[PDB]
């Protein structure tokens, strides 16, 4: 949406079940989003028309909650592993 709520759109609508946390990469203008049922970390573009998987089909993720970014590194927290 617009930061005043005047425009609203849905950008990720499929292959999504319990989307927990969001983070933004400003140089690339990318949105980073994380899912706790399908257990993935993905990044897409502001319109949701380019989409990619960072961690997927990996047992490292149990119940992710929150996400942050720095340089070429992504940090997250997991409630199942307490990690």
């Amino acid at each position: 949406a617009s930061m005043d709520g005047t425009m609203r759109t849905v950008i990720v609508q499929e292959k999504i079940y319990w989307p927990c946390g969001l983070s933004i990469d400003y140089p690339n203008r990318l949105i980073y989003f994380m899912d706790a049922y399908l257990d993935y970390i993905e990044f897409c573009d502001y319109d949701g028309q380019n989409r990619r998987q960072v961690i997927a089909s990996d047992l490292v993720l149990h119940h992710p909650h929150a996400l942050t970014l720095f340089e070429d590194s992504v940090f997250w927290t997991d409630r199942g592993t307490h990690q």
Partner: protein, 149 residues
Amino acid sequence: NQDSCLHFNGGCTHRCIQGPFGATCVCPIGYQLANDTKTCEDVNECDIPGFCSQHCVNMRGSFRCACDPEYTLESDGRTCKVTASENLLLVVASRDKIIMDNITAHTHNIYSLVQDVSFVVALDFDSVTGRVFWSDLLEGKTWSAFQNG
């Protein structure tokens, strides 16, 4: 294949070389050769996710990369690094403790910032005031403090 490699470059775009099967064809660094085994094509390096960190422009057999003003490009041609001298500071929320970690050349230092926090859930920071904001679920409140507690 074609012995006429010698006569007409084998119809190949860049270069043909003689061999036991008549023709062999090669494209230089950054290029790619395809199903016809004769033409040359350019690797669109920017199509690889994360080839270079921030901005990428494809060129014939080459690439160009750029970083935003907060960042300086490194000598290799792909990596970007941060100009600010301050260490990375990483803040995590546990119910009784706002944990803070300080990063120095891939070494860690972990401590607990603020006293008397009940159940912290959400965190953010403001760079103008140099402050950290958090919310407490048992208190039903939002608090702000300095990065030194």
